[PDB]
Structure formats: C-alpha cells, structure tokens
Design a protein around this ligand. Structure first.
Ligand SMILES: OC[C@H]1O[C@@H](O[C@H]2[C@H](O)[C@@H](O)[C@H](O)O[C@@H]2CO)[C@H](O)[C@@H](O)[C@H]1O
Length: 138
C-alpha cells in the first residue's frame, strides 16, 4: 500500500475534467479522513469525514486561507464505514469540485480558491490504509 499521510503532486495544478481517484480502506475505530487540495500553504479544498463528532458522523468541507479556516460546509450523508474499503472520486468541474464515493454522488464544493492552476498538491491523511491515489483526464 501507500504511506499515510500521502501527498500527491498535481502537476500544473487542477483543471476542469481532471478526475482524481483515491482507493483505500477505512481503519476499524477510525476517527477522521482528510483530503487537502493545497495551494502553497493554503488549503483550497479540505474534505474531512469525521466518524465521531459529538457521536455523529459528518463530513466537513472548508478552505484555509493564510492559516485561517473559512465557513465550513457540512454534509450529513456519510457513505464511509469503519473497516470497509472505499473509493473517493473528485472530479474537477469549472465551478466546483464534484465528489463521488463508491460511485454515488456525495457533494459539490464551489471553488473559493480561483487560481485552479496553482492547486498543485493533494494531501491525503487520516485513519485509512491507502491503496491507490491517481488522476486522469476525462
Ligand atoms: O473547517 C475544517 C477544520 O475544522 C477544524 O475544527 C473546527 C471545528 O470543525 C469547528 O466545529 C470548531 O468550532 O472549531 C474547530 C477549529 O476550527 C479542524 O481542527 C481542522 O482540522 C479542519 O478540519
């Protein structure tokens, strides 16, 4: 497998029709998963499934600019399960990141960081075994 935290370069950054596919297994007793699309120190798109936030499972999305978190966008649909293999697909669209999990549309995140060509790293972290992380152009 791959080592977590894992950082995947996005050469020349992200562009519409770029599809990123993450395969992994959620650890038993997992607490968190995080995908961080980075523009230098800023986090353009933080995708953060939380398995126990006040005894609820929730996905938090946010952007971090100059070390400051913005308005969180929370999704209560939680297709992840401890112990079980997942597929995360992030499709870059002109106005948002489109996320599907195990082939089901999960959420959309309107681009707050506008310089898409400067979002050049994807950090992958959390309580998972990482099987594969790749991108393609569709
Ligand atoms: O917004 C993503 C960001 O959240 C941080 O935790 C927040 C928490 O979600 C919020 O409910 C609370 O009031 O403030 C905390 C600190 O901002 C996480 O620490 C961070 O990892 C990100 O996931």
């Amino acid at each position: 497998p791959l080592i977590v935290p894992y950082n995947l370069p996005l050469p020349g950054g992200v562009v519409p029709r770029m599809l990123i596919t993450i395969l992994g297994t959620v650890k038993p007793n997992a607490n968190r998963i995080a995908l961080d699309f980075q523009r230098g120190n800023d986090v353009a798109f933080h995708f953060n499934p939380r398995f126990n936030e006040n005894n609820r499972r929730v996905i938090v999305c946010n952007t971090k600019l100059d070390n400051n978190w913005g308005r969180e966008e929370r999704q209560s649909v939680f297709p992840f399960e401890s112990g079980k293999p997942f597929k995360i697909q992030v499709l870059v669209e002109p106005d948002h990141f489109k996320v599907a999990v195990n082939d089901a549309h999960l959420l959309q995140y309107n681009h707050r960081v506008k310089k898409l060509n400067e979002i050049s790293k994807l950090g992958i972290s959390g309580d998972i075994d990482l099987t594969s992380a790749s991108y393609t152009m569709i």
